[PDB]
PDB file of all heavy atoms in Angstrom:
ATOM      1  N   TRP N1410     166.935 131.355 212.579  1.00 36.01           N
ATOM      2  CA  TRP N1410     167.537 132.657 212.331  1.00 36.01           C
ATOM      3  C   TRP N1410     166.813 133.716 213.149  1.00 36.01           C
ATOM      4  O   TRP N1410     165.581 133.696 213.244  1.00 36.01           O
ATOM      5  CB  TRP N1410     167.480 133.014 210.848  1.00 36.01           C
ATOM      6  CG  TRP N1410     168.602 132.446 210.065  1.00 36.01           C
ATOM      7  CD1 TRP N1410     169.813 133.020 209.839  1.00 36.01           C
ATOM      8  CD2 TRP N1410     168.620 131.188 209.393  1.00 36.01           C
ATOM      9  NE1 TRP N1410     170.592 132.196 209.068  1.00 36.01           N
ATOM     10  CE2 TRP N1410     169.880 131.061 208.781  1.00 36.01           C
ATOM     11  CE3 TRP N1410     167.694 130.152 209.250  1.00 36.01           C
ATOM     12  CZ2 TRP N1410     170.238 129.942 208.036  1.00 36.01           C
ATOM     13  CZ3 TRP N1410     168.050 129.044 208.510  1.00 36.01           C
ATOM     14  CH2 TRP N1410     169.311 128.947 207.913  1.00 36.01           C
ATOM     15  N   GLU N1411     167.575 134.630 213.742  1.00 36.19           N
ATOM     16  CA  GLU N1411     166.970 135.729 214.483  1.00 36.19           C
ATOM     17  C   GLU N1411     166.297 136.699 213.520  1.00 36.19           C
ATOM     18  O   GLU N1411     166.964 137.459 212.811  1.00 36.19           O
ATOM     19  CB  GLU N1411     168.024 136.449 215.327  1.00 36.19           C
ATOM     20  CG  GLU N1411     169.356 136.685 214.630  1.00 36.19           C
ATOM     21  CD  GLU N1411     170.319 135.524 214.781  1.00 36.19           C
ATOM     22  OE1 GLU N1411     169.854 134.369 214.887  1.00 36.19           O
ATOM     23  OE2 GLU N1411     171.544 135.766 214.791  1.00 36.19           O
ATOM     24  N   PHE N1412     164.968 136.667 213.494  1.00 35.69           N
ATOM     25  CA  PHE N1412     164.172 137.469 212.577  1.00 35.69           C
ATOM     26  C   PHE N1412     163.766 138.760 213.272  1.00 35.69           C
ATOM     27  O   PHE N1412     163.132 138.724 214.331  1.00 35.69           O
ATOM     28  CB  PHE N1412     162.935 136.689 212.112  1.00 35.69           C
ATOM     29  CG  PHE N1412     161.855 137.545 211.511  1.00 35.69           C
ATOM     30  CD1 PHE N1412     161.864 137.841 210.160  1.00 35.69           C
ATOM     31  CD2 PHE N1412     160.813 138.027 212.288  1.00 35.69           C
ATOM     32  CE1 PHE N1412     160.870 138.616 209.599  1.00 35.69           C
ATOM     33  CE2 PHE N1412     159.816 138.805 211.731  1.00 35.69           C
ATOM     34  CZ  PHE N1412     159.845 139.099 210.386  1.00 35.69           C
ATOM     35  N   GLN N1413     164.132 139.892 212.678  1.00 34.36           N
ATOM     36  CA  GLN N1413     163.764 141.193 213.204  1.00 34.36           C
ATOM     37  C   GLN N1413     162.878 141.923 212.205  1.00 34.36           C
ATOM     38  O   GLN N1413     163.358 142.325 211.136  1.00 34.36           O
ATOM     39  CB  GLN N1413     165.011 142.035 213.509  1.00 34.36           C
ATOM     40  CG  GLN N1413     164.726 143.292 214.315  1.00 34.36           C
ATOM     41  CD  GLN N1413     164.321 144.464 213.443  1.00 34.36           C
ATOM     42  OE1 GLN N1413     164.750 144.574 212.295  1.00 34.36           O
ATOM     43  NE2 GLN N1413     163.483 145.341 213.981  1.00 34.36           N
ATOM     44  N   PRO N1414     161.602 142.128 212.509  1.00 33.90           N
ATOM     45  CA  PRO N1414     160.706 142.797 211.568  1.00 33.90           C
ATOM     46  C   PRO N1414     160.867 144.310 211.597  1.00 33.90           C
ATOM     47  O   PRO N1414     161.306 144.903 212.583  1.00 33.90           O
ATOM     48  CB  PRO N1414     159.319 142.386 212.072  1.00 33.90           C
ATOM     49  CG  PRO N1414     159.502 142.269 213.547  1.00 33.90           C
ATOM     50  CD  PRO N1414     160.935 141.844 213.791  1.00 33.90           C
ATOM     51  N   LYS N1415     160.500 144.927 210.478  1.00 35.52           N
ATOM     52  CA  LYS N1415     160.484 146.376 210.391  1.00 35.52           C
ATOM     53  C   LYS N1415     159.244 146.932 211.086  1.00 35.52           C
ATOM     54  O   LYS N1415     158.332 146.199 211.477  1.00 35.52           O
ATOM     55  CB  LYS N1415     160.529 146.829 208.933  1.00 35.52           C
ATOM     56  N   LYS N1416     159.214 148.253 211.231  1.00 36.02           N
ATOM     57  CA  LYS N1416     158.133 148.942 211.924  1.00 36.02           C
ATOM     58  C   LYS N1416     156.864 149.055 211.089  1.00 36.02           C
ATOM     59  O   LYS N1416     155.987 149.854 211.435  1.00 36.02           O
ATOM     60  CB  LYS N1416     158.593 150.335 212.359  1.00 36.02           C
ATOM     61  N   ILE N1417     156.756 148.292 209.999  1.00 34.75           N
ATOM     62  CA  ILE N1417     155.589 148.376 209.131  1.00 34.75           C
ATOM     63  C   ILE N1417     154.338 148.019 209.916  1.00 34.75           C
ATOM     64  O   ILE N1417     154.360 147.147 210.793  1.00 34.75           O
ATOM     65  CB  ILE N1417     155.777 147.464 207.903  1.00 34.75           C
ATOM     66  CG1 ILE N1417     154.689 147.734 206.862  1.00 34.75           C
ATOM     67  CG2 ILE N1417     155.803 145.996 208.311  1.00 34.75           C
ATOM     68  CD1 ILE N1417     154.781 149.107 206.229  1.00 34.75           C
ATOM     69  N   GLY N1418     153.241 148.712 209.618  1.00 32.12           N
ATOM     70  CA  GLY N1418     152.006 148.478 210.338  1.00 32.12           C
ATOM     71  C   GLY N1418     151.363 147.157 209.962  1.00 32.12           C
ATOM     72  O   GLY N1418     151.501 146.661 208.844  1.00 32.12           O
ATOM     73  N   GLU N1419     150.645 146.578 210.927  1.00 31.51           N
ATOM     74  CA  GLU N1419     149.980 145.303 210.682  1.00 31.51           C
ATOM     75  C   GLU N1419     148.817 145.453 209.712  1.00 31.51           C
ATOM     76  O   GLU N1419     148.485 144.506 208.994  1.00 31.51           O
ATOM     77  CB  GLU N1419     149.496 144.703 212.001  1.00 31.51           C
ATOM     78  N   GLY N1420     148.185 146.623 209.683  1.00 28.65           N
ATOM     79  CA  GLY N1420     147.077 146.864 208.781  1.00 28.65           C
ATOM     80  C   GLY N1420     147.457 147.689 207.568  1.00 28.65           C
ATOM     81  O   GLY N1420     146.592 148.262 206.900  1.00 28.65           O
ATOM     82  N   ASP N1421     148.753 147.759 207.277  1.00 28.80           N
ATOM     83  CA  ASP N1421     149.257 148.586 206.190  1.00 28.80           C
ATOM     84  C   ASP N1421     149.011 147.895 204.848  1.00 28.80           C
ATOM     85  O   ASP N1421     148.361 146.851 204.763  1.00 28.80           O
ATOM     86  CB  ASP N1421     150.737 148.889 206.408  1.00 28.80           C
ATOM     87  CG  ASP N1421     150.959 150.082 207.315  1.00 28.80           C
ATOM     88  OD1 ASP N1421     149.991 150.515 207.976  1.00 28.80           O
ATOM     89  OD2 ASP N1421     152.100 150.586 207.371  1.00 28.80           O
ATOM     90  N   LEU N1422     149.529 148.489 203.775  1.00 30.63           N
ATOM     91  CA  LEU N1422     149.462 147.911 202.442  1.00 30.63           C
ATOM     92  C   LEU N1422     150.871 147.803 201.885  1.00 30.63           C
ATOM     93  O   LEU N1422     151.689 148.709 202.066  1.00 30.63           O
ATOM     94  CB  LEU N1422     148.587 148.752 201.506  1.00 30.63           C
ATOM     95  N   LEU N1423     151.153 146.695 201.206  1.00 30.15           N
ATOM     96  CA  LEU N1423     152.494 146.405 200.725  1.00 30.15           C
ATOM     97  C   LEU N1423     152.447 145.952 199.274  1.00 30.15           C
ATOM     98  O   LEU N1423     151.408 145.533 198.760  1.00 30.15           O
ATOM     99  CB  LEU N1423     153.176 145.332 201.581  1.00 30.15           C
ATOM    100  CG  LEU N1423     153.477 145.738 203.023  1.00 30.15           C
ATOM    101  CD1 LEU N1423     154.025 144.557 203.810  1.00 30.15           C
ATOM    102  CD2 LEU N1423     154.445 146.909 203.056  1.00 30.15           C
ATOM    103  N   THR N1424     153.599 146.052 198.618  1.00 31.67           N
ATOM    104  CA  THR N1424     153.771 145.601 197.247  1.00 31.67           C
ATOM    105  C   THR N1424     155.108 144.885 197.122  1.00 31.67           C
ATOM    106  O   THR N1424     155.900 144.834 198.067  1.00 31.67           O
ATOM    107  CB  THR N1424     153.704 146.766 196.252  1.00 31.67           C
ATOM    108  OG1 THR N1424     153.830 146.263 194.916  1.00 31.67           O
ATOM    109  CG2 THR N1424     154.822 147.758 196.521  1.00 31.67           C
ATOM    110  N   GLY N1425     155.347 144.319 195.942  1.00 31.23           N
ATOM    111  CA  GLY N1425     156.579 143.602 195.683  1.00 31.23           C
ATOM    112  C   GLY N1425     157.823 144.447 195.859  1.00 31.23           C
ATOM    113  O   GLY N1425     157.851 145.614 195.458  1.00 31.23           O
ATOM    114  N   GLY N1426     158.859 143.869 196.464  1.00 33.40           N
ATOM    115  CA  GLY N1426     160.117 144.553 196.657  1.00 33.40           C
ATOM    116  C   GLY N1426     160.225 145.364 197.928  1.00 33.40           C
ATOM    117  O   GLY N1426     161.302 145.905 198.207  1.00 33.40           O
ATOM    118  N   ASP N1427     159.151 145.472 198.704  1.00 32.74           N
ATOM    119  CA  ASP N1427     159.213 146.208 199.958  1.00 32.74           C
ATOM    120  C   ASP N1427     160.092 145.475 200.962  1.00 32.74           C
ATOM    121  O   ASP N1427     159.970 144.262 201.152  1.00 32.74           O
ATOM    122  CB  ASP N1427     157.810 146.403 200.529  1.00 32.74           C
ATOM    123  N   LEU N1428     160.983 146.220 201.611  1.00 36.31           N
ATOM    124  CA  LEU N1428     161.871 145.661 202.628  1.00 36.31           C
ATOM    125  C   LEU N1428     161.095 145.591 203.935  1.00 36.31           C
ATOM    126  O   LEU N1428     161.220 146.450 204.809  1.00 36.31           O
ATOM    127  CB  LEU N1428     163.134 146.500 202.766  1.00 36.31           C
ATOM    128  CG  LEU N1428     164.100 146.443 201.583  1.00 36.31           C
ATOM    129  CD1 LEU N1428     165.101 147.583 201.661  1.00 36.31           C
ATOM    130  CD2 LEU N1428     164.814 145.105 201.543  1.00 36.31           C
ATOM    131  N   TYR N1429     160.281 144.544 204.069  1.00 36.17           N
ATOM    132  CA  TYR N1429     159.350 144.471 205.189  1.00 36.17           C
ATOM    133  C   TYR N1429     160.033 144.042 206.481  1.00 36.17           C
ATOM    134  O   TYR N1429     159.456 144.194 207.563  1.00 36.17           O
ATOM    135  CB  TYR N1429     158.204 143.519 204.851  1.00 36.17           C
ATOM    136  CG  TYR N1429     158.562 142.056 204.956  1.00 36.17           C
ATOM    137  CD1 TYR N1429     158.280 141.331 206.103  1.00 36.17           C
ATOM    138  CD2 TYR N1429     159.159 141.394 203.895  1.00 36.17           C
ATOM    139  CE1 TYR N1429     158.599 139.992 206.197  1.00 36.17           C
ATOM    140  CE2 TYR N1429     159.482 140.056 203.980  1.00 36.17           C
ATOM    141  CZ  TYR N1429     159.200 139.359 205.133  1.00 36.17           C
ATOM    142  OH  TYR N1429     159.519 138.024 205.220  1.00 36.17           O
ATOM    143  N   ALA N1430     161.248 143.503 206.398  1.00 34.85           N
ATOM    144  CA  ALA N1430     161.914 143.032 207.608  1.00 34.85           C
ATOM    145  C   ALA N1430     163.417 142.951 207.341  1.00 34.85           C
ATOM    146  O   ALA N1430     163.892 143.426 206.305  1.00 34.85           O
ATOM    147  CB  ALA N1430     161.287 141.696 208.051  1.00 34.85           C
ATOM    148  N   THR N1431     164.156 142.355 208.275  1.00 34.09           N
ATOM    149  CA  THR N1431     165.586 142.131 208.127  1.00 34.09           C
ATOM    150  C   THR N1431     165.991 141.022 209.084  1.00 34.09           C
ATOM    151  O   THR N1431     165.614 141.030 210.258  1.00 34.09           O
ATOM    152  CB  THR N1431     166.397 143.402 208.407  1.00 34.09           C
ATOM    153  OG1 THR N1431     166.013 144.431 207.486  1.00 34.09           O
ATOM    154  CG2 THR N1431     167.883 143.130 208.252  1.00 34.09           C
ATOM    155  N   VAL N1432     166.767 140.068 208.576  1.00 34.87           N
ATOM    156  CA  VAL N1432     167.176 138.900 209.342  1.00 34.87           C
ATOM    157  C   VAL N1432     168.696 138.849 209.395  1.00 34.87           C
ATOM    158  O   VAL N1432     169.374 139.111 208.397  1.00 34.87           O
ATOM    159  CB  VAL N1432     166.592 137.598 208.752  1.00 34.87           C
ATOM    160  CG1 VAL N1432     167.054 137.395 207.320  1.00 34.87           C
ATOM    161  CG2 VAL N1432     166.969 136.407 209.614  1.00 34.87           C
ATOM    162  N   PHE N1433     169.231 138.536 210.577  1.00 33.42           N
ATOM    163  CA  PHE N1433     170.676 138.488 210.794  1.00 33.42           C
ATOM    164  C   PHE N1433     171.189 137.087 210.466  1.00 33.42           C
ATOM    165  O   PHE N1433     171.480 136.267 211.339  1.00 33.42           O
ATOM    166  CB  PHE N1433     171.010 138.880 212.225  1.00 33.42           C
ATOM    167  CG  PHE N1433     170.634 140.286 212.565  1.00 33.42           C
ATOM    168  CD1 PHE N1433     169.465 140.552 213.256  1.00 33.42           C
ATOM    169  CD2 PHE N1433     171.441 141.344 212.188  1.00 33.42           C
ATOM    170  CE1 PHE N1433     169.110 141.847 213.570  1.00 33.42           C
ATOM    171  CE2 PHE N1433     171.092 142.643 212.498  1.00 33.42           C
ATOM    172  CZ  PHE N1433     169.924 142.895 213.191  1.00 33.42           C
ATOM    173  N   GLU N1434     171.294 136.821 209.163  1.00 33.52           N
ATOM    174  CA  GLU N1434     171.766 135.516 208.714  1.00 33.52           C
ATOM    175  C   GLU N1434     173.186 135.247 209.196  1.00 33.52           C
ATOM    176  O   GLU N1434     173.575 134.090 209.393  1.00 33.52           O
ATOM    177  CB  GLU N1434     171.690 135.426 207.191  1.00 33.52           C
ATOM    178  N   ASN N1435     173.968 136.304 209.397  1.00 32.05           N
ATOM    179  CA  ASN N1435     175.339 136.184 209.865  1.00 32.05           C
ATOM    180  C   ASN N1435     175.840 137.557 210.282  1.00 32.05           C
ATOM    181  O   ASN N1435     175.073 138.520 210.368  1.00 32.05           O
ATOM    182  CB  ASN N1435     176.252 135.578 208.791  1.00 32.05           C
ATOM    183  CG  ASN N1435     176.291 136.406 207.523  1.00 32.05           C
ATOM    184  OD1 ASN N1435     175.720 137.493 207.458  1.00 32.05           O
ATOM    185  ND2 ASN N1435     176.961 135.889 206.503  1.00 32.05           N
ATOM    186  N   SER N1436     177.140 137.634 210.548  1.00 34.21           N
ATOM    187  CA  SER N1436     177.778 138.931 210.707  1.00 34.21           C
ATOM    188  C   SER N1436     178.294 139.420 209.358  1.00 34.21           C
ATOM    189  O   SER N1436     178.629 138.622 208.478  1.00 34.21           O
ATOM    190  CB  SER N1436     178.921 138.841 211.717  1.00 34.21           C
ATOM    191  OG  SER N1436     180.022 138.129 211.184  1.00 34.21           O
ATOM    192  N   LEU N1437     178.335 140.741 209.195  1.00 36.46           N
ATOM    193  CA  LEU N1437     178.852 141.480 208.049  1.00 36.46           C
ATOM    194  C   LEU N1437     177.936 141.385 206.829  1.00 36.46           C
ATOM    195  O   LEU N1437     178.206 142.048 205.827  1.00 36.46           O
ATOM    196  CB  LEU N1437     180.270 141.041 207.631  1.00 36.46           C
ATOM    197  CG  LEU N1437     181.452 141.724 208.315  1.00 36.46           C
ATOM    198  CD1 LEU N1437     181.473 143.199 207.962  1.00 36.46           C
ATOM    199  CD2 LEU N1437     181.401 141.533 209.822  1.00 36.46           C
ATOM    200  N   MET N1438     176.871 140.592 206.870  1.00 38.38           N
ATOM    201  CA  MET N1438     175.976 140.430 205.729  1.00 38.38           C
ATOM    202  C   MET N1438     174.526 140.397 206.198  1.00 38.38           C
ATOM    203  O   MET N1438     173.752 139.518 205.817  1.00 38.38           O
ATOM    204  CB  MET N1438     176.327 139.178 204.931  1.00 38.38           C
ATOM    205  N   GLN N1439     174.158 141.337 207.072  1.00 40.26           N
ATOM    206  CA  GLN N1439     172.787 141.408 207.566  1.00 40.26           C
ATOM    207  C   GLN N1439     171.804 141.338 206.405  1.00 40.26           C
ATOM    208  O   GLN N1439     171.780 142.215 205.536  1.00 40.26           O
ATOM    209  CB  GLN N1439     172.576 142.691 208.366  1.00 40.26           C
ATOM    210  N   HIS N1440     170.999 140.282 206.395  1.00 40.90           N
ATOM    211  CA  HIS N1440     170.165 139.919 205.259  1.00 40.90           C
ATOM    212  C   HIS N1440     168.876 140.726 205.311  1.00 40.90           C
ATOM    213  O   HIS N1440     168.019 140.481 206.166  1.00 40.90           O
ATOM    214  CB  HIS N1440     169.875 138.418 205.275  1.00 40.90           C
ATOM    215  CG  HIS N1440     169.259 137.901 204.015  1.00 40.90           C
ATOM    216  ND1 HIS N1440     169.992 137.266 203.036  1.00 40.90           N
ATOM    217  CD2 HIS N1440     167.978 137.909 203.579  1.00 40.90           C
ATOM    218  CE1 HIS N1440     169.191 136.912 202.048  1.00 40.90           C
ATOM    219  NE2 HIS N1440     167.963 137.290 202.353  1.00 40.90           N
ATOM    220  N   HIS N1441     168.743 141.682 204.398  1.00 39.31           N
ATOM    221  CA  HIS N1441     167.572 142.550 204.356  1.00 39.31           C
ATOM    222  C   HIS N1441     166.468 141.847 203.580  1.00 39.31           C
ATOM    223  O   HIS N1441     166.273 142.111 202.389  1.00 39.31           O
ATOM    224  CB  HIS N1441     167.924 143.887 203.714  1.00 39.31           C
ATOM    225  CG  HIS N1441     168.965 144.658 204.461  1.00 39.31           C
ATOM    226  ND1 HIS N1441     168.700 145.320 205.640  1.00 39.31           N
ATOM    227  CD2 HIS N1441     170.274 144.876 204.192  1.00 39.31           C
ATOM    228  CE1 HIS N1441     169.801 145.910 206.068  1.00 39.31           C
ATOM    229  NE2 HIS N1441     170.771 145.657 205.207  1.00 39.31           N
ATOM    230  N   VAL N1442     165.747 140.949 204.251  1.00 36.88           N
ATOM    231  CA  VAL N1442     164.680 140.202 203.600  1.00 36.88           C
ATOM    232  C   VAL N1442     163.601 141.162 203.116  1.00 36.88           C
ATOM    233  O   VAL N1442     163.300 142.172 203.765  1.00 36.88           O
ATOM    234  CB  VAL N1442     164.111 139.139 204.557  1.00 36.88           C
ATOM    235  CG1 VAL N1442     163.410 139.789 205.734  1.00 36.88           C
ATOM    236  CG2 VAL N1442     163.165 138.205 203.819  1.00 36.88           C
TER     237      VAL N1442
END
Protein backbone atom coordinates (compact mmCIF):
# COMPACT_ATOMS: atom_id res chain seq x y z
CA TRP A 1 0.00 0.00 0.00
CA GLU A 2 1.23 3.50 -0.81
CA PHE A 3 1.92 4.87 2.67
CA GLN A 4 1.98 8.65 3.02
CA PRO A 5 3.05 9.96 6.44
CA LYS A 6 1.89 13.19 8.01
CA LYS A 7 4.20 16.12 8.73
CA ILE A 8 4.55 15.04 12.38
CA GLY A 9 8.03 15.55 13.75
CA GLU A 10 10.35 12.61 14.30
CA GLY A 11 11.16 13.82 17.82
CA ASP A 12 7.59 14.83 18.66
CA LEU A 13 5.25 13.32 21.27
CA LEU A 14 2.12 11.35 20.41
CA THR A 15 -0.86 9.74 22.11
CA GLY A 16 -3.64 7.33 21.21
CA GLY A 17 -5.93 8.34 18.37
CA ASP A 18 -3.50 10.73 16.69
CA LEU A 19 -3.82 10.69 12.90
CA TYR A 20 -0.10 10.21 12.38
CA ALA A 21 -0.34 9.25 8.71
CA THR A 22 -2.70 8.35 5.84
CA VAL A 23 -2.63 5.42 3.43
CA PHE A 24 -4.37 5.21 0.04
CA GLU A 25 -5.97 1.81 0.48
CA ASN A 26 -8.13 2.58 -2.56
CA SER A 27 -9.97 5.35 -4.34
CA LEU A 28 -12.87 7.19 -2.62
CA MET A 29 -11.89 5.76 0.80
CA GLN A 30 -8.47 7.25 1.58
CA HIS A 31 -7.61 5.38 4.77
CA HIS A 32 -6.62 7.84 7.50
CA VAL A 33 -4.45 5.49 9.56
